Amino acid sequence: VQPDRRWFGNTRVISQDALQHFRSALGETQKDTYQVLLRRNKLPMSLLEEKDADESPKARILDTESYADAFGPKAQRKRPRLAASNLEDLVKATNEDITKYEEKQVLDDKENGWTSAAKEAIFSKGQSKRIWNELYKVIDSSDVVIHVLDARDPLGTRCKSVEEYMKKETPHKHLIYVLNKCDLVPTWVAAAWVKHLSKERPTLAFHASITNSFGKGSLIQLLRQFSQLHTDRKQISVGFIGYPNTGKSSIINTLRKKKVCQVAPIPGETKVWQYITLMKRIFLIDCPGIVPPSSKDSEEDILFRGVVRVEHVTHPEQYIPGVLKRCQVKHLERTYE
Amino acid sequence: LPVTVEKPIPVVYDLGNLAAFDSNVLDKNDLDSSNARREEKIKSLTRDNVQLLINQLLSLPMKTTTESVGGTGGQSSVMTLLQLPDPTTDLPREKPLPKAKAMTKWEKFAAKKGIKPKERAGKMIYDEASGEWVPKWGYKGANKKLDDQWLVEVIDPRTLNRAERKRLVKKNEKQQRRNMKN
Amino acid sequence: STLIPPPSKKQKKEAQLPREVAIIFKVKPVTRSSSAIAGHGSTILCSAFAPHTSSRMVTGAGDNTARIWDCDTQTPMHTLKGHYNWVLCVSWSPDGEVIATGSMDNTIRLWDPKSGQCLGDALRGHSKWITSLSWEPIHLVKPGSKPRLASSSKDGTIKIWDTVSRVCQYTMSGHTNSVSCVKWGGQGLLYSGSHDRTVRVWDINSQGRCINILKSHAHWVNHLSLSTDYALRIGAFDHTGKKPSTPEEAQKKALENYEKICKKNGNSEEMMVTASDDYTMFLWNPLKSTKPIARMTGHQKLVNHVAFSPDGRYIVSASFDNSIKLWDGRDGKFISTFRGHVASVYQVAWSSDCRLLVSCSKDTTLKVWDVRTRKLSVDLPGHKDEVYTVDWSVDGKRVCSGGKDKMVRLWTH
Amino acid sequence: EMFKVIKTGKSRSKSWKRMITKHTFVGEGFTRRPVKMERIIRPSALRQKKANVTHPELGVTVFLPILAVKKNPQSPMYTQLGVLTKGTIIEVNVSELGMVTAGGKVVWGKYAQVTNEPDRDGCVNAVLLV
Amino acid sequence: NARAKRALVKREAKLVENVKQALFIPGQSCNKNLHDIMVDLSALKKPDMKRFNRKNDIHPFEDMSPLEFFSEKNDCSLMVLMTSSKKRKNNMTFIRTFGYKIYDMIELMVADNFKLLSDFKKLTFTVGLKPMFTFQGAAFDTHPVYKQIKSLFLDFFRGESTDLQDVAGLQHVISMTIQGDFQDGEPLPNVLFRVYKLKSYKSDQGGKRLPRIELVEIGPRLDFKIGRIHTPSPDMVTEAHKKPKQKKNVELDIMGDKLGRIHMGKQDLGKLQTRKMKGLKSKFDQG
RNA sequence: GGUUGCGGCCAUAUCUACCAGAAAGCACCGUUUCCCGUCCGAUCAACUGUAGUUAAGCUGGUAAGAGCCUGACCGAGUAGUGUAGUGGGUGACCAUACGCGAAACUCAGGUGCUGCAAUCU
RNA sequence: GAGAACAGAAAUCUCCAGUAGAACAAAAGGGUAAAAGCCCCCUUGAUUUUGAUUUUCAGUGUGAAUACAAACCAUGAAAGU
Ligand SMILES: [Mg+2]
């Protein structure tokens, strides 16, 4: 490396007036749902950060009395801190703490000594990091991720904690919503769903089928527009993501007007991702259905979502009562009958 | 006394040239050369037009900057200056645009092959068997160091090397003149 | 450089159209620098303009020899000498007849402005380096007597000094840790911060007996200040700078200047404030109550400085988060947060007109804000290193600053 | 080295591929190339968005985001690939350090040269170029 | 050798051309009063101005070659040849060029009533400020001859095309007005060039900030008479107006973001037909 | 009306030999303590105005002085020059018109005006 | 032109005369005059990034050149260059 005034030569210096202008413009950053980012100009965001606040986190108490004086053989903290002002306020605070403790205890098997049976491994899917690594691969490889959502319960189909990762690590990604299986729900329900999800994502309607289907032309025009937005890229990859058995492989076969991807009712038919081409300017992609783990996953709710294959459940009969919680009695009467 | 002014036909404005135009009909009697007052009416009309222009120019947003000491060409923070819109009055160009570009018979071959533009990183390059860098161009050159070496181990060879360098220079000048011909 | 993006062509077409026609005592802000003044080969630690005129000024540094400066000529004037350690702090008497400074060594030395010679034997007694000084206000002083000089040290003891006898008329040791600062209020009750996370108002009239002990901060107090500190420091020296014809006239003018600010609410109750390392600040009215009127808070890092506005209407404080925060002077309510500094702020000085606030930070470029617009007024680059200190002249004609570059610099409109 | 011979397909004969075995600054707008056109590979585990630049002045050291790879010696095509390899210069966001050039134009970026080998540890240390 | 390269760069078609230089050419017939009017007009043109002490016998309408030669030799595309004759008294043949080739020509003979700058109030007039313009009369925006005179005066006196200007620099305003309205086919009324020094005073009745304006004439006074005229060929008019030229569903959002837009259209949901599930049909029932 | 600083026009302003400059303001001048640079305190830099001079620069006046410049309906709307008609002729070219339109030459005049601030018997 | 030990018509030195047939890459050719010529002092620059073209295929918020424009540079007291 030869010596030069560069490298010890200034590069990114900027005037303070530009910083004040960006600080004034930070409040104008609101964006329409139709708007989509293409490039994030490099700015000293650390100087523009630190919005006004009145929280003032806890002071570094360790500097005055770290560990030794507070307790131990030295025990130099002879007296309690804050010198409670009055005995009457002390009795009031004690009564308030006792009432709060009683209210906490009021909130709530071991007494018989039995323990819950171990959870079936089938509910763990899709954990084991395999489908998760496939999801991260299709996300990084896709110029524009799209997230399908079941029309029956799009709020329960959301893959939360993943969209935040796409927003943070990869702001450029669009992550447009899709709402398939409109035929299984009343059209007014899908209309209200798209009206509610329009605030954040386009939530384009769809009903995958190699036969006649709704919305294939709108999704095709939208993909053509996104490809027009990335002419410099030389093409635009796309990658379906969502819960298992969301119809991503069916939506891809509908976009191709052919039975390209294998499609079965069982959630696990998509063993692995496969590349697909249409118009030579865009490549479809799909990954196995993702199930962001959470303590609220309410296993029986994992079953009602279709994520688990019902054949493997040890006790299919015990899940029957919950199906009545959702379906109306008149439909279950008319169907069976 | 009031700064307000108005005409049946609103005045046209070009704030970029600091210019304004008035389509309102002129009074032929006031403009007659014989009148002693002819200068006064023209002065009042120019004053009204300048008042309208100042009413327009004063409304333009003004730039501000905190820089004050050591600015190369920045305006002083105490100073304020109007943001003039680019002029709407097109004017003829002074000279034809320099559109006489030529590929010089090389850029086409570069497009036909995998060749790529030179890195343009720097003339300097480390000399062999030496503790200090010897630039290849723009300063004492290692290519000319061969003439300065005490022995060539082979007519003087240094004269042949200078002849080869002059031949390369004349070939470059000939290629430049040939590209000048087209 | 990342220039602001060019306006869109539609914005230019809109700008081409006619637009935005609608038929329907003051200090000049500093905006420019001045030639550097070479001096002692040590970083400047403090500076203070002479209350009676901006032409005179003095600054401490790591050199033992304090240097008075002739700001009108930007040249050294009657350099001080005698100390054997760093001049940790400097302060001018409100009457202006005597200078005072606190060396890192225990010795303290008064100086005569007329020649710069030390005014008698150096004061002594402190067990540790001096921390701050506070001259007694002239209006409390009886005519024909020199104001007493308060003093403090890292040991936390304070010793009131009789400048005539050069002896400590009183002493106290109620603080268990270092006294970060001390100030002599116009009500006759002394106040001072401490490193022990405590503040203790003192009544000098009662032989220095203590009367109250504040206890609200989560961390050590720093830079105690009062709304009246500007009037107590200026010494009844109005911006015109005319000297009073008689000492009794000086006492009357000082009492009038104090009453003009003390009675802003119709009653004589000066406000008090105490910065702390707990990212919090507290308004105080010790005569009214032992508990804060409000708990100012919001800074992301420890406050380094506080300065009441000369009228007392506004409060402001330096912080390590690189964002000075204005606050109301009557209740401490938040107003606006200044921004622009790239590094932790050290101290700030209010303009005499109250419309501006010069500031400095660890970043080499000191700045001054126009408080009325709640926005930066003009940057003041030029310092080669950190601007450790800044101060504004009482008349507002000039400003001075120090730093680690060992190059004192003056600023003026 | 620096190019692992990845193999692919039912018959691993051509293998048509290479992969970097060292850390690389892929950039904020990577948008992985489609696999069919993917010859070179820079696996995400080896990528880093930050480097532990240290300022010789004041003795301070701070973790700051990487900005760009300026000059990599030893076939700077590696600099086109973003490799650091114990000596490559890299732009860094120096705004956290408080640097301010004369004239009031506050700095927010400065060059830095990596020292520690990325391959031997996950940290990317570098000395700031004052 | 580098010094010649700077002159060559100055004699080049920059994408943002420098303000055109002026080169007054006194004539062999020029009267001393015409030379005084020429110096007066040149004083407004500073600093981008030049002079040639030698007298000349140029005949631009009879032979344009010498003007095209001097325009290249002096790098002054603008030219204003002084001339006088028994018929065309006090002639002032303004000239313009594109590439040093002739662009247009027009005669602007001075009226006998011209007044020199010395015959006016001695108000301060800072050099190098950009004059304001205030054209009057509808013919300037419609008549091709008056439009050419307006474009010529603007190209001559507009000065630098700065993107920003101080209010302090508006110390003067050039003015022009036609000698009344005229019916089509009538002889062109003489132009009335004028100049005035700006003045300002408190208004108190027209806004807190806007000041009352006032003018004081400083000259030079002139009343040009139109004469022979020439116009560029249409291909020259096309070549001289081309922009340097140095994006749909894309825009530079504030803060530099290059936000796009999908602009998704209306999509009726009624075209879809819900699946005829056995539980929805009314044909089945119980009880 | 004289003069100093800044200027605009850029020989009506420059060159040659003499004469005058009352009062006021440069300048010549005397010196090398200090800042400063040359081989040389000659120029440059600095010192106060002290010993003086209007001897020079400089402002004016003179000269059948040399150049230069101004306007005249002075050459002159002349010379030169494109235009039409077979008007003459084998033709070149010649008279008839309105256009663009000179100069040498002749007559008379002059050898600097002018803005800002200041000062002067 | 007047001159200067050796020294003359050609050495180097001095005074009065110069619109510059000085050396300004220069070619028609206008022109440079307290310089664009001679002498003396200090110095990098093939620095960084923003866009519109250039081909590329780990085509990439530029990975690199071309042109645009902002910082930075050297100088001077500065104008400015
Ligand atoms: Mg399935």
Question: Would you write up a description of this structure?
Answer:
Chain E: It comes from Saccharomyces cerevisiae (strain ATCC 204508 / S288c). This is part of a larger assembly, with chains A (337 residues), B (182 residues), C (413 residues), D (130 residues) and E (287 residues). By secondary structure, chain A is α/β, with parallel strands linked by helices. Chain A has a domain at 129-286: Rossmann fold, CATH 3.40.50. Chain A has helices at residues 16-25, 45-48, 87-106, 130-141, 154-157, 162-169, 187-197, 216-228, 248-256, 299-304, 320-326, 329-336, and strands at 35-36, 144-150, 176-180, 204-205, 236-241, 276-278, 282-284. Chain A has a six-stranded mixed β-sheet with strand order 4-3-2-5-7-6, sandwiched between helices. The N and C termini of chain A lie far apart (83 Å). In chain B, a hairpin with a 4-residue loop joins strand 1 (12-14) and strand 2. The radius of gyration of chain B is 34 Å and the shape is elongated. Chain D has a five-stranded mixed β-barrel with strand order 1-2-3-4-5. Chain D is elongated. The two termini of chain D are 33 Å apart. Chains in contact: A-B, A-C, A-D, A-E, B-C, B-D, B-E, C-D, C-E. The A-E interface holds A 22, 25-26, 28-29, 31-32, 34-41, 43, 182-187, 190-191, 202, 204-205, 207, 214-215, 218, 221-222, 225-226, 228-229, 331-335, 337 and E 248-250, 253-265, 267, 269-275, 277-282, 284-286. Magnesium ion (MG) is lined by residues 245, 264, 266-267, 269 of chain A. Chain E binds two RNA strands through residues 1, 3-4, 15-16, 28-29, 31-32, 35-36, 39, 43, 51-53, 57, 59, 61-62, 69-70, 72-74, 85-88, 118, 122, 124, 228, 244-246, 258.
